[PDB]
Amino acid sequence: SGLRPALSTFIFLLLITGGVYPLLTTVLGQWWFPWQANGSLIREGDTVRGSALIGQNFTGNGYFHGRPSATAEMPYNPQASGGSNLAVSNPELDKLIAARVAALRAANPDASASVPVELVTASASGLDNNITPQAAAWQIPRVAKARNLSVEQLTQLIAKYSQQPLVKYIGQPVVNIVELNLALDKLDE
Amino acid sequence: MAAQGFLLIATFLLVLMVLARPLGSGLARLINDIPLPGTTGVERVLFRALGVSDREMNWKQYLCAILGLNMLGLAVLFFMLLGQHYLPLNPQQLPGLSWDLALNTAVSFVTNTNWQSYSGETTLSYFSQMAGLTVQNFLSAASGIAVIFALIRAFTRQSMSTLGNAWVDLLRITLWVLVPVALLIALFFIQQGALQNFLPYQAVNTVEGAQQLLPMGPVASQEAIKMLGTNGGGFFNANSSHPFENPTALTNFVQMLAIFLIPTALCFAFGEVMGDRRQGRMLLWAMSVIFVICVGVVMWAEVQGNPHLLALGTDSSINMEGKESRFGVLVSSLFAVVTTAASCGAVIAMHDSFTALGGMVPMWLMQIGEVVFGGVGSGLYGMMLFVLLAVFIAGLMIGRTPEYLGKKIDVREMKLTALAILVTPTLVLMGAALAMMTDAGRSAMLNPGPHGFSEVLYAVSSAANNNGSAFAGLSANSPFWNCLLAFCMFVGRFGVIIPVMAIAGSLVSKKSQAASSGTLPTHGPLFVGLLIGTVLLVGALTFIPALALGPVAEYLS
Amino acid sequence: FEPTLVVQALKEAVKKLNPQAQWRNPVMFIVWIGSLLTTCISIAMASGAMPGNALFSAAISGWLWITVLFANFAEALAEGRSKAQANSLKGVKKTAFARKLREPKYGAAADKVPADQLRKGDIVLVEAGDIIPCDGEVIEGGASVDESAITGEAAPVIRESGGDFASVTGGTRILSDWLVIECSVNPGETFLDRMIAMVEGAQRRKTPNEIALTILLIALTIVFLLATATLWPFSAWGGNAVSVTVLVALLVCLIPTTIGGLLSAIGVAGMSRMLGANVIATSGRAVEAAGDVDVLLLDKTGTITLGNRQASEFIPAQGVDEKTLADAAQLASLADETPEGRSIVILAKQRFNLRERDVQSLHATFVPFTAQSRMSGINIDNRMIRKGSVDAIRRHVEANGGHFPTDVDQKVDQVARQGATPLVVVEGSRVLGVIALKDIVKGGIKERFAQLRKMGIKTVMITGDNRLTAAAIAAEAGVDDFLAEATPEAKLALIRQYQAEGRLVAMTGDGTNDAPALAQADVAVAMNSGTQAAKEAGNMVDLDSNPTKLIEVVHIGKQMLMTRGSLTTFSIANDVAKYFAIIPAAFAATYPQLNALNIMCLHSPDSAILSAVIFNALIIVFLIPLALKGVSYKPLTASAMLRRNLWIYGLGGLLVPFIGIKVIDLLLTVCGLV
Amino acid sequence: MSAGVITGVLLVFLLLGYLVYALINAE
Ligand SMILES: [K+]
C-alpha cells in the first residue's frame, strides 16, 4: 500500500536529490570554477591538446615516457579506464614487466643501472599523468640527447612543473607529464 | 617510510575525531527527535505538505515501510535502467542495458551495496547517473542511518510501544544530514578538479597523432554521496583512481574523512544519547584498535611488495602495479583498509594486484561482516549485534542472566541476534561454493592459481556483505554471475535488516531494569577485549579455510 | 557414584535411544549422522570402493559411537527420571476389586469385579477398610471416608445420604461404616484420570541458561558445518581435492560437543552434590535451576504441619473443671488407635498423670464413629463416654430433650475461628467441654521463612484445607499472602500463572493432592513423610522431614551456577582452541605448501584428526571429574568474577586442546596405528 | 555426473534447514 506518505515522500526525495542537488551543484561549478569543472583541458587554438589530469601515450623519444597503462583496447585509452589486474604470482605480469624493462633498457642505455618501479609497473586506473621526481629525473640524459638540451634547465623544468602535497605523509611529490611535454613543444620554437 | 604511516594514521584519526563531534551531536539530536536549529518550522510545513504529519509506528510498520520504499526504488531503478533509450540527456546514443545487468545494477544501487560490473563510459548514460543512481545512493544511506536510528531509539526508549515515523525520519536525515556535507565536499572536489557539467564526449588530439575520446559526466555530484554514504561505485571503471574522478591526495584525504565520518558520528550520537560517553568511546576504541593493527601488516606487506621486482632490476621492490603515483603506496594501503572496513566499494587502487597478505587482511575485514568503522548505517548495528553477542557470551561465562544497558535480553533476542550474525557468513560461503561448482563462474578467471578463487571469494563476499569492492578483471557480465550476486546482495542486506527490527521491537516493549549484581559493566578495556575477541574469533571460526585456501596459499607458495 | 543396578538399567535406556528421539539433542544427532556416514563408507570399503584405507574410518566410526553412547549416557543420568511418574496412581486405579451388587441392599449378591466392569448405571458397595472404585453418588447409608486426594487432610469426613453430601470421587480410603455407591461416572475421565491427565503430562519448561546454551551450540554448529561444507568446493581448484570421509571427520570433530556434554555433566554433578544436603535428586536440571527461583509454594498438612493433628487444650465450661473433662477425654481415648487419641493420652499424662485406667481391665465397651450419629467413645457400667463434632452433639441434645449449652457453642466457634477443630464430650450432663484439636507448627521454620524473605523468595502457602486454620498457620509461620480451599487444578493454575509471569517456581508437598503441582513445578521437592505419589512425582525427595531444605538447595544451586559458568568458559575456550588446533590438517592434503601452517608438525592429517576424535571422546568423559571438586566458590562482583573466571579457565581452554592433540598423536605414533 | 556431490549438497541443505529449525524452536 504505502499511499501518500510513501509515494509523495519518495517523489520529493527523488526531486530534491536528483534535480535540485545536481542542478545547483552544476550551476555553482560552472559559475565559480569553469576551467576546473570542464575537465582542465588545454585549449591551444580551437583544437584540444589534451587535459591536465589524464595523460597520453608519449611513445616517441625525448617525450618523457610515462607510466604503463594496460587499458582495454589501446594504451592510455581514457574511455576504458581499466587497470592491469594481474596478481603477484601471475607469470603474465612477470613476462610483461620483463619485456617492458627490456624495452626501457634498450631505449635508455646509460640512464642508470636500475630502473624505477613506477615507470615499469602499470597504474591502477590505466591513466596516470603524474610521476615521482626521482623517476622523472631517471630519464634526464636520454631526453637531453634527443632534444639537444641541458640537464640543468631540464631539472629546473621538472622542478617548475612539480606538484607538492600540503603535507609529506599524505602522498608523494609528483610532476605532470602532459604539461611538461607541452612545455617542451613550446620550447621547440 | 616506517614513521610516515604512523604520522598518516595519527593525522587521519585526529581529524576524524575532530570532525565527528559536531555531527555526532547533531545526529544525537536526530535520535532525540528535537528539531535542528533553523529548521523547526520549515520541516513542519514540509511534513504537512507531504502528508506524513506525525504518526508513531511500531517495528512492523517501520520495517515494512523501509522495505517498501527500498522495493519501490528498486522497481523504479530497474525500469529506468531498462528504458535507457527513451530517457533524455544521452550525448552518445548508448544502448539500453541487458536484463541481467539492469537487475544487477538495480539491486546494487539500492541496499547500500553499490557493486559495479560495468564501465559507465560505454554503458551508463547521463540521466541514469544524474537522476536514478544518485537518489538511490541517497535512499540507501538514508535507510541505513534510519534503521540505526530506530535501533538506538529502541535502546534509549523504556516501556514504550513505538519507534518513530519512517518518512519523517528519512526526510530529516537526507535533507539536512547528507546534502549540506555533500555540498561542502563536492565544491572541494570541483576546486581540486572534477567534472560537474553536461558536455558531450570530447575528442582529444595528442602530440603522438593518436586521438582519443575523453569521458564526460557529473562526477562530483556522485562523489559527494559515494564517499559520504559509503556506496562505492562511480562513473568510471576505476572507482576512485581515475584522474577526473579523484584528482589529488588532498581530495583522497577528504574522501577518507567522508567514508569514516558517518559511522563514527553515529557512534558519538549513540554515546551522547545513552547519557554516558563511556559507551561511545568504548565502541570507538574497539574499532580503532582493529583499524590501527589492520592498517598495519597491510602497510608492511605493501612496502615489502613484489619479490620478483627486486631481482628483475627495479631499484625499489615496492608493490606498484596496482596503484598510482599521485597518491603513493602507504595512502593506497590506508584507503584499501578503510574501504574494506567501511563497506564502501570505492577502490583507490587495483586490489587484485596487491600482495597476498596485504590483500587478505583487507579481505579479512571484508569477510568479517563490515563492523569495524563500518557502513553508513550498517556498521553500527553490526557492532550492536556483535556486542550483544559478547554480552550473552559473558553472561553464559558468568552463570547469570545477561543484560545490556540496563535492559534484560531473552531467548527471542537470542535467536534473532544469532540469525542476524550468521546470515552473512552463510551467504558468503554458500554462494562462493556454488560459484566454484559451476564451470561458468570458473570460466570468469583472470589470475590462474589460488588468486582466481580469491577473486571469486572477494566477489561473493562483496555481494553478501554489502560492500561493492572488487578484485577487478572478473568477467561479471555473465547472467549467472549477475543473478547470483544480485540475489546475494538482496537477501544479505534484507536478512540482516529484518532481525534488526525484530530486536528493536522486542527491546521497545521492555523496561530499563535497575542495577544488579549480575549486570556486566558495559565499558572498559576488559569489555573491549571481550568484544574484539568475540567478533575476531567468530570470524576466524567461519573464515579460516576460505582465506587459507586462497591468499594464504598464494603467500606460502 | 550411583548404584550398579540403576546405572545398568539406565544404560539399557541409553541403548534404547533411536533416531526417532535422537534429534532432541542437535549436536549429538549431527555426530550421529556423521557416525552413520562414516560407518556406511567403512562397510563400503569392506565391500570395495575407490580408496584403499578402511581401518582408519572404522576406528573413527567406533570412537564416534563411543562418544554418542557416552553423551547419551550422561544425558540419561541427568534427565532419565525428570519425567513425572504416575505409577502409584495407575496401581491404585488398577487394583480394582470392587464389590458388585445386582440388588441395592446391605447384603445381596455381591462379587469381586475389576475396574472395567463399571459402566453407566451400577451398584457397588465398599463396606469398611477398602477403596472406592470410581466416582459416583451415595444411594443409602453413612460412610466416614478419608479425603486424602482432595483437600489433603487426613481427618475423616462423614458423607451420609439423602442430602448435599453425596459425591464420592473414588480412590479415597473409607475408614469405617459401609456404603453403597451408584456408578454415575464412566471408566475413564473420572477424578483420578483427570488427575493423571497432567500428572503424566508434566512437560517442564527449559531453563533460560539451557536455552541460551542450546542456541550457542546451534550457532557454532552452523559455523562449523558451513566451513566443512564449503571446504569441498574450495578444494576443487587444487591439484587434489579433500576426501569425503575426512570431511565427515572434520564435521564431527569441529562442532561444540564439549558444551553439549557439559549440558548434562552439570546435572550429573548436581545429583552427586545434592546428597550433601540429604536430598534424593532425580534430575539435575532442577538442581541447576534452583539458583534462579523466586517463589515457593507450600502445602500445610504434611510439609508445614507435622502430619497428624495434635491436641492443644481441654476447654471446659464454667460448671465443670479441668479434671472433670480430662478424665472423660482419657476414657474417650483409651481404645483409640488414632494418633489424635495418642495425643489425648499424652496430654492426659501432661496434666494429671492419670493411672489405673487399663484398656482391658476396665470393661471398655467401645462404640466406634457411628455413620448415622457421628458419635464415638467408651462405655463403662455407670458412665457413658461419648464425644463428637458439634452438629452430632446438637443432634444428641435434641434426641435427649435437654437444654442446649450455647456457652459451649460460643467457646467452640471461638476456638474454630482461632483455627482448631472441636471435639465435644457428653458426660456430666450437657455442660462438659471440648478438646481443641489444632494444627501444629514444626521446629522453628519462622526464622528460615524470614531468611527466605531476606533472600527474595516469596513464600505462598496453598493447601486446600480450611481457610481459617490456613490463615492461622500462615500467620504463625510468617508466610506471605496465601490461598486456601484450592483444587489440584487450582494448584496447577497457580503454577502455570507463576510460570507465565516469567519467574521460576518451586513447590514442596507430601500428599497425592499436589502431585500435579509437583509435576508442573520447576524445582519440585517431595517429602519422605508423605505418600508414594508425591515421591514418584517431582524432581527432589527430601530424606529428612525438614521443609526448609530449599535454603541449602538454593545455596548449592547458586554455587553450581557459578561453577557452570566456569565450565562454560572452559568449554567455549576449548572448542575455539580445538578449531585452530585441528584446522590445518584439512590443508596439507589439498595443498603442499600449507604444511608450514601445521605449526606442531603433526605426523599426518589422518593421525591428527583421529587424535581429534580421541580428544572428542575424552573431554566429555573428563568433564565430570572437572565438574566435581570445583575451585572457585566464593561470590565476587560481576566484572572481577568474570575476569578471574576468564583468566583461570581460558588458560585451561587454550592449553588443554593443543597438549591433548599433541599427546594423543605422540601415543598413536609410538603405537604405530598410523 | 555427480556420483555423490549432489547428495552431499542436499544433505548439507537439509541439515542447515534442520539447524535453523532448532534455532527457531528451543527443543
Ligand atoms: K550489512
Numbering used by the authors:
A (entry chain C): 2 to 190
B (entry chain A): 1 to 557
C (entry chain B): 9 to 682
D (entry chain D): 1 to 27
What do the study authors state?
KdpFABC is a high-affinity prokaryotic K+ uptake system that forms a functional chimera between a channel-like subunit (KdpA) and a P-type ATPase (KdpB). The heterotetrametric KdpFABC complex comprises four subunits, namely the channel-like KdpA, a member of the superfamily of K+ transporters (SKT), the P-type ATPase KdpB, the lipid-like stabilizer KdpF, and KdpC, whose function is still unknown. At high K+ levels, KdpFABC needs to be inhibited to prevent excessive K+ accumulation to the point of toxicity. This is achieved by a phosphorylation of the serine residue in the TGES162 motif in the A domain of the pump subunit KdpB (KdpBS162-P).
To determine the predominant states under turnover conditions, non-phosphorylatable KdpFABS162AC was incubated with 2 mM Mg2+-ATP and 50 mM KCl for 5 min at 24°C immediately before plunge freezing and analyzed by cryo-EM. The second structure obtained from the KdpFABS162AC sample under turnover conditions was resolved globally at 4.0 Å from ~28% of the initial particle set. In the respective cryo-EM map, a density is observable immediately adjacent to KdpBD307 and the TGES162 loop is in close proximity, which is the hallmark of an E2P or E2·Pi state. However, on closer inspection, the density fits better to a to a covalently bound phosphate than to a coordinated Pi. In light of the ambiguity at the given resolution, we have assigned this structure to an E2P state which might be transitioning to an E2·Pi. In comparison to the E1P·ADP state, the A domain in the E2P state has undergone a tilt of 60° and a rotation of 64° around the P domain, positioning the TGES162 loop to dephosphorylate KdpBD307 in the P domain, while the P domain is also tilted by 40°. (C, D) The outward-open half-channel closes off at the KdpA/KdpB interface, while a new, inward-open half-channel opens from the canonical substrate-binding site (CBS) in KdpB to the cytosol. The E1P·ADP and E2P structures obtained for KdpFABS162AC confirm that, in the absence of the inhibitory KdpBS162 phosphorylation, KdpFABC progresses through the entire Post-Albers cycle under turnover conditions, with the ADP release in the E1 state and the orthophosphate release in the E2 state likely being the rate-limiting steps that lead to an accumulation of the observed states.
